[PDB]
Amino acid sequence: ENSWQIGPRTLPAPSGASDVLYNIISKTPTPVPTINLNLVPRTESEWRAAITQLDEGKVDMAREISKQLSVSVEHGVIEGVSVYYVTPVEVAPDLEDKLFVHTHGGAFVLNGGEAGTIEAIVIATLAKVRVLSIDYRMPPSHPAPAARDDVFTVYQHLLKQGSAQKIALGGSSGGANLTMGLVQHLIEQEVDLPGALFLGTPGADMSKTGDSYYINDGIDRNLVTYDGFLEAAVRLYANGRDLKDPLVSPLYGDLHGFPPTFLITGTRDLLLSATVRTHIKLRQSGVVADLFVYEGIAHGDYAVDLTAPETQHAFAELNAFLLQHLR
């Protein structure tokens, strides 16, 4: 109760953002925290229903972007793990022998299958690099650490094929969580590390620790609130582990030895704190880490409209970051 009671605030669309983002936000209704507050699956069957509902239309969006941008998206399997090969029409000359291994976002149970390729498609086209998106097994059907295992399995296979230094690894939210956890494991096991990491709005701390969980409650148009669904998803993922257990919230683990890391979030992101806390911990641990925070941007909004100047800039920066660090 040493906490602050903040009165109601009024939040206008941000004229500081691009016209594209300003218009997106301006057309977004005030986020409604009761939906996510009331979406609390308890049974595996309720989970399957919630998940389907939340994933609705994702595949359609993915294919639409793919067709429009001439991105090839092809399902395959690597050592039993579902993957998607995502090839853009233009691969940067110096990224021609490089690979971006992508781990999709969503809160640990979302974006299975082709639904998870949206961000991979964005990265592929705009960062001009081939992407391999890992369709890792998720709860409720496949409790942790099935997802962790899948990412590790694909990564190990890739190292049989070529140098880890030519590989970038990452993604957003829950996938960024697996990415951080994987890298920590690799460092422990003295396995070769990726040449670079991408952590977009990472689910780095899934306990309700972080200013933005409180400050941006009702302000992040996508996650809206930690309470209800997100916490339930986190707890499903945690599978009995403490939420500050580094296996659940990798921010609490050691970040020394991390490859150069690129992080992105925005002023309205519920995971803004998770992101900047991670960026700071990386820097404090002697890691090259570049942070980008976009005015107006909520969780994942940097990869929702390819015409946003924010998005075009962000991935042009990612491209430059991959050119600098991958070899």
| Residues in contact with Na ion, shown as a per-residue x/- string from 184 to 223 under the rule CB under 5 A | ----------------------------------------
Judge contact between 126 and 320, C-beta under 8 A: no
Could you give phi then psi for residue 135, rounded to 5 degrees? -90, 70
**Residue 143 or 218 having the CB closest to a second copy:** 218
**Residue 196 or 276 having the CB closest to a second copy:** 276
Measured in residues, the chain has a length of: 327
Among 91, 295, 305, 306, binds a second copy (CB under 8 A): 295
Closest alpha carbon to 172 in 245, 238, 123 = 123
* Shortest distance, position 223 Cβ to a second copy, whole Å: 15
**Residue 111 or 125 having the CB closest to Na ion:** 111
What residue has token string 């309470």?
227
**Residue 15 or 45 having the CB closest to a second copy:** 15
Q: Which helix (H) or strand (E) holds 280?
A: helix 272-284
Cα separation, 283 vs 324, in Å, equals 18
Q: What residue 285 binds from a second copy, Na ion, none (CB within 5 to 8 A, per partner kind)?
A: none
Classified as helix, coil or strand, 195 is coil
Q: What residue 313 binds from Na ion, a second copy, none (CB within 5 to 8 A, per partner kind)?
A: a second copy
Structure tokens at 79: 């050592």
* Shortest distance, position 283 Cβ to a second copy, whole Å: 7
- What DSSP state is assigned to residue 240? T
Among 82, 184, 201, 273, binds a second copy (CB under 8 A): 273
Of residues 226-255, those binding a second copy (CB under 8 A): none
- Measured distance between the N- and C-terminal CA atoms of the chain, rounded to whole angstroms: 51
Of residues 118-177, those binding a second copy (CB under 8 A): none
Among 137, 277, 299, 325, binds a second copy (CB under 8 A): 277
Q: What residue 189 binds from a second copy, Na ion, none (CB within 5 to 8 A, per partner kind)?
A: none
Is residue 272 at the binding interface for a second copy, with CB under 8 A as the rule? yes
| Residues in contact with a second copy, shown as a per-residue x/- string from 177 to 216 under the rule CB under 8 A | ----------------------------x---xxxx-xxx
- What DSSP state is assigned to residue 301? G
What residue has token string 């936000």?
25
The last residues before gaps in the chain (C-N over 2.5 Å) are none
CB crowding 294-322: b at 16 or more within 10 Å, else e: bebbbbbbbbbbbebebbeebbebbbebb
Among 276, 282, 297, 304, binds Na ion (CB under 5 A): 276
**Residue 29 or 80 having the CB closest to a second copy:** 29
CB atoms within 10 A of CB 214: 16
173-188 vs 146-161: helix crossing angle, rounded to 10: 60
Of residues 1-40, those binding a second copy (CB under 8 A): 2-16, 26, 30-31, 33
Of residues 70-129, those binding Na ion (CB under 5 A): 106, 108, 110-112
Cα separation, 196 vs 282, in Å, equals 13
Interface residues with a second copy (CB under 8 A) are 2-16, 26, 30-31, 33, 205, 209-212, 214-219, 267-268, 272-273, 276-277, 279-280, 283-284, 290-296, 309-310, 313, 317
